[PDB]
Structure formats: structure tokens, C-alpha cells
Design a protein around this ligand. Structure first.
Ligand SMILES: [Mg+2]
Ligand SMILES: [Mg+2]
Lengths: 260, 261
């Protein structure tokens, strides 16, 4: 068994998908999860204007709407959350995402006072905080904001993690990685695009990451589909895989092996 | 196989321990982890004055000190963190804990401006926040503060989770639950006490609202984790918390997961 095969098995990626089926599978998964947890009424999701949160958000809103029609229980709601740090660069992709989703409720929680208070408290203790580090603070503050809403509104927090991020460990641990349920887990990036095409999403919702990673989504996706890619791209992917193992396992106990 | 045996297997709890041995096992575990991750130099831990953080903190400091003696590498440090929300009620248990640990470095990060800013932003959006909820916000903000320190000081974050909390799910998910490495995992509550006895800890550091909150005593939790028979009411209570806390004890739920069904 190659490393590639073993990664493909862990992440559950199919070489190709039926989009419509995958839509249905996800919606039913999201409904089943709610039906089993009878005290839960809401799904909560940060909406960034990016492909992942747009798709997940849409799938969640559909699950709620159907479940509400099925049960006649109006307390079922999807809560979209906007989480800008200060005055957000372009709210335009977000606006389109929200329009497409048509969410039951939208809340805007500005994380800037919280993030700034955190950084000030660090700095006052003599801890300088880099841009990267601040970035992780923001992602983790968004986790807090979403869990706070969920604690008040009988909610489960939706995570946007999917196979193309997971293989690369391209998320903040206990940040955007911090969530209850992962509707998009098993899908690679292009597979996400396909689902959005089938849902009729504005083409602008799915057209730096790759430069940060040193590898393209084309390559990541192809690797996840069991295809052969260049050696340099393979080594890059495999670097990220090994590096991100701790993000992909539970906290390390004395009985753990994977890190040894 | 009873549920109890299966819980005991998952959490790795021994009916009894040799404290000195368990001490050594933990320290060596903490050293090995650092040796393997050559870019890491520090362990980082919130110090609350409670038994769990006191013990974990001490075990981590001993790992660092030894490893520093072994390697002659001075960059190895234990970073204790104080994480009060405002002017803390009694910093006294904390003081004793820090005195016992004798940490290389101690940082005080007041979380109040961050927590307050977070609740303000929530409240301004019309989300009322109960005391419980705020409590979880604080535990998560501590997670943030510790990960920020670790990102700056080439650190791993120590978690204080242990078997008596784990079985009950008695932690905030992605809060105090949020950590890199769990030195105390496998130990029940009284086993923690024993290690601290052997380390010479002031008896005040380990001798509850917790038990009232849970509806069950640590005596009972511990005994259940040691494979002993307890009352039916305590058993049913423990087993309630077990099933309820399963989501805190697994990875985020994917479409392939089973444990919740
Ligand atoms: Mg994304
Ligand atoms: Mg504790």
C-alpha cells in the first residue's frame, strides 16, 4: 500500500462522484444527526464568501428546511454568522453567499474587540505576536463566537473541513478545525465546485492558498483521486500530510503511536 | 464485557498505581515527545491552583529540567501561565502551585478584555449569554492565550485532561480540552493525589461544586474507574455522562462516523 492509497482511505475520497447523490447524502446525514439529538434545533456556520462555507451553509440550510417541513417544528433554523475583524475588505463575496443560501437567520459578530484584547494582554506580558499567530487567534475567536451562539441557540457548529484542506493540514487547530460536524469531509476541492454547480451557485462563488502551500489544488485533487502527479508536488503534499497529523488526531496520550 | 470494563479499556485506568513509576513514565513520555519534535523547545501550561494543572505542571517542569541537563540546551523551558479574568478571587492556591512547581518562566495573561469584547459583540447581535456559556468562553479564551504563547515560544500546549474528567466529559470542548499532549490521561482523581503526595506537594494543593454539578462523587467516579462496584444511581449517573460526552472524546463527526448512532 502506497502512502497515497492510505491517505485516500483515511479521507474517504472517491476518484469521481455523482454530485446530486453527494448533495443528498450530506443533507440526509445532517438531518439524521439532528433527529438523533432531540435537544438540538439549530446548525450554526460562519459564512466567509468562500466556496467551502458557501456549500456547507447551503447544504445545512437545506437540511433544516426539509426537516422543518417534515416535522412541522419551526424551532429548526440555520444561523449564518458573519465574523469580520473590523471593517471587512469586500463584503461582496459574503453577500452573494448569503443570497444563494437564503439563511433563516444571519448574525454579525465583530471579533475585533476580542482579538485586540487578547493581543494586548499577550503584548502587555511581553509576548510579541506575529501576523501568522494573530491569524490563528482570529480563527480561534471565530470558533468561540460560533460555539457561544450554538450554546445559546441549541446548536451544533458546522465545520467546513474537506479532503483538500485535511491532507494539507490547511486549517487552524481548534479554530476553523474546531466544529461538531463536517458535512464536506470526503470531498476534494473540485468536487466541492461540482456540488455548487449542481445547486445553481453564481459562478463567482467558486473561481494565495496555493502559493502558501507550494502546491496547486489541481495537484492536491488529482492526488486525492489516485492519479500520478509530479514528484515535487508529491513530496510537498506528503510533507504537509506528516506535518498535520497532530491536527488530524486527538490530543496525544501516553498510549498514542502516530507521532513516534 | 460490561460498559464499565470497556470504559476502563478506552481510558487506560489501572486499579492501582505505583506513583513513583507513574511519575517516571510521564516525565519520559514528555521528554520523548520533545526529542522527537526538534523544533519544539517549550511546554506551556495554564496554572489554576487546582490539582490537575499543579501536577501536570510539575511533571512538565521536571521533563524540561532533565532534558536541559541531558542536552545542555538552555532553550528548553517550562512556561507557566496565569490566566485570571480580571482581579482573581484568591490567587493563593495559584501562588502555592507556582511555588511547588518552581517554573522556569511565568506569564500573566489577563483574559478579561478578550472575553468582554467577545460577549459584547455577541450581546450587541442580540445573543444573550448565560453564566455557563460565558464560562465556556473563558475556558476557550485560555486555550487561545496558551496557543498564542506556544506559537511564539516554539511550544506544545499541555492539557490537564485525566480519566475522572474524561469519563464525565467534565471539560469545555476546544477549551481546556484543547491541547497538544495529555500527561495525566489514564489517571483517576485519587491517583493524581498520590503522585502529588510523592512529589511532596503542600497538602492544600489537593485536599466540591464539581461533584454537585455532576450529581456524583469523585469517590464513586474513581471507584468505577478502578473496576469496583458502586451504587446503581452513581453508576447510571456516570454512564449518562459517558454517553453524553462521547462527542467531546471523538474527532468532529464525519459521514463515516458511527459512535453517535
Ligand atoms: Mg476553506
Ligand atoms: Mg481539572
Amino acid at each position: 500500500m502506497t502512502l497515497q492509497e492510505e491517505i485516500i482511505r483515511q479521507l474517504g475520497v472517491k476518484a469521481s462522484i455523482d454530485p446530486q447523490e453527494e448533495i443528498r447524502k450530506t443533507v440526509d446525514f445532517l438531518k439524521a444527526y439532528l433527529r438523533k439529538h432531540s435537544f438540538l434545533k439549530t446548525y450554526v456556520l460562519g459564512i466567509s464568501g468562500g466556496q467551502d462555507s458557501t456549500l456547507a451553509g447551503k447544504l445545512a440550510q437545506m437540511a433544516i428546511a426539509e426537516l422543518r417541513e417534515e416535522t412541522s417544528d419551526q424551532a429548526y433554523q440555520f444561523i449564518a454568522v458573519r465574523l469580520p475583524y473590523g471593517v471587512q475588505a469586500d463584503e461582496a463575496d459574503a453577500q452573494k453567499a448569503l443570497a444563494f443560501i437564503a439563511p433563516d437567520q444571519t448574525l454579525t459578530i465583530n471579533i475585533k474587540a476580542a482579538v485586540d484584547g487578547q493581543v494586548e494582554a499577550l503584548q502587555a506580558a511581553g509576548v510579541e505576536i506575529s501576523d501568522f499567530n494573530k491569524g490563528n487567534i482570529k480563527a480561534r475567536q471565530r470558533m468561540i463566537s460560533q460555539y457561544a451562539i450554538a450554546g445559546q441557540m441549541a446548536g451544533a457548529v458546522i465545520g467546513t473541513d474537506h479532503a483538500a484542506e485535511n491532507i494539507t493540514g490547511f486549517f487552524t487547530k481548534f479554530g476553523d478545525g474546531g466544529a461538531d460536524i463536517l458535512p464536506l469531509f470526503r470531498l476534494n476541492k473540485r468536487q466541492g465546485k461540482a456540488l455548487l454547480k449542481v445547486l445553481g451557485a453564481d459562478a463567482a462563488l467558486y473561481e494565495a492558498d496555493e502559493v502558501a502551500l507550494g502546491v496547486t489544488y489541481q495537484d492536491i485533487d488529482d492526488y486525492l483521486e489516485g492519479k500520478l502527479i509530479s514528484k515535487v508536488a508529491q513530496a510537498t503534499i506528503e510533507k504537509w500530510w506528516h506535518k498535520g497529523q497532530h491536527k488530524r488526531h486527538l490530543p496525544i496520550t501516553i498510549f498514542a503511536d502516530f507521532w513516534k
